[PDB]
Amino acid sequence: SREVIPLWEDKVADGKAWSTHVYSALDKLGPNLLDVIPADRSLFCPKYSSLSYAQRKQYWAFVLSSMVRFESNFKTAMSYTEDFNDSNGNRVISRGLLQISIESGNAYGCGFKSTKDLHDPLQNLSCGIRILDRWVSRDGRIAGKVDGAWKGGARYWSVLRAGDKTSYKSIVSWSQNLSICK
């Protein structure tokens, strides 16, 4: 039985299916994510190195749900025009649960064929897993600005970037107080 349940099961009707999808997608798209022992575990999840494979999947589903909370408040339809440009000089449009954009997302191999695909919560969450799989495993840590460079998921998502703000503070607090982490 699960020890940790993601926050979207509290908020959205389809949240249990989102979890089912994320556990599957972590197996397939997050194998490197699930092998990292992150250097900032003392902040995010003090007992991380003791977690089983299944527990690490529960952990990452929960953290993803806390990112979704502050990126989109669980609104898969969300579409937000940013103040920075894509490769054509057009304003980037961030989409869906994790506020991913189509050009940047597809660079990770997410294979969005239409902008509408980013509003499919399952495709959106899969892409988030690909992004984490790349940076958390490359950088060996979940977040943080280290020696002048943002690391891990903080490379992509503002809510993972340390600052005196509700999103980051909540994500860290909720993570480190998970029973499996504490």
Numbering used by the authors: 73 to 254
Provide the authors' original text about this structure:
Here, we discover a family of Bdellovibrio proteins that define a new subgrouping of the lysozyme superfamily and demonstrate that they possess outright specificity for deacetylated peptidoglycan. We solve the structure of family member Bd0314 (that we named DslA), revealing adaptations to the lysozyme fold that sterically restrict the active-site cleft into only accepting polymers deacetylated at the GlcNAc positions. We determine a role for DslA in B. bacteriovorus exit from the prey cell and demonstrate that exogenously added enzyme is able to prematurely liberate predators from prey bdelloplasts before completion of the predatory lifecycle. The architecture of DslA is related to, but significantly different from, other members of the lysozyme superfamily but still fulfil the inclusion criteria for the lysozyme superfamily noted by Monzingo et al. — conservation of the β-sheet floor and helices D and F, with appropriate placement of acidic catalytic residues.
We were able to successfully purify the enzymatic domain of DslA by omitting the lipobox and ~35 aa region of low complexity/disorder, fusing region R74-K254 to maltose-binding protein (later cleaved). This construct yielded two independent crystal forms, diffracting to 1.26 and 1.36 Å resolution. Attempts to solve these via molecular replacement with “conventional” lysozyme structures failed, indicating potential divergence from the superfamily fold.Table. All four of our DslA structures (two wild-type, E143Q, E154Q) are highly similar, other than a relatively small flexation of the β1–2 hairpin in the E154Q variant. The secondary structure elements create a classical two-lobed architecture, with helix E and β1–2 sat below a pronounced active-site cleft (measuring ~25 Å across, ~15 Å deep). Partial activity for HEWL against the GlcNAc-deacetylase-treated material was indicative of our in vitro prior deacetylation of E. coli PG not running to completion, and illustrative of the difficulties of reconstituting B. bacteriovorus activities in vitro outside of the bdelloplast. Despite this, DslA was clearly inactive against native, acetylated peptidoglycan, but displayed strong activity against the deacetylated material; this level of activity was on a similar scale to that of HEWL and mutanolysin with their known substrates. Of the six saccharide rings, GlcNAc “c” and “e” sit with the 2′-NAc groups facing inward. These two positions are occupied in DslA by Y228 and M150, the former placing the sidechain OH in the same position as an acetyl oxygen. Hence, specificity of DslA for GlcN over GlcNAc presumably arises via steric blockage of ring c and e if the sugar groups are acetylated.
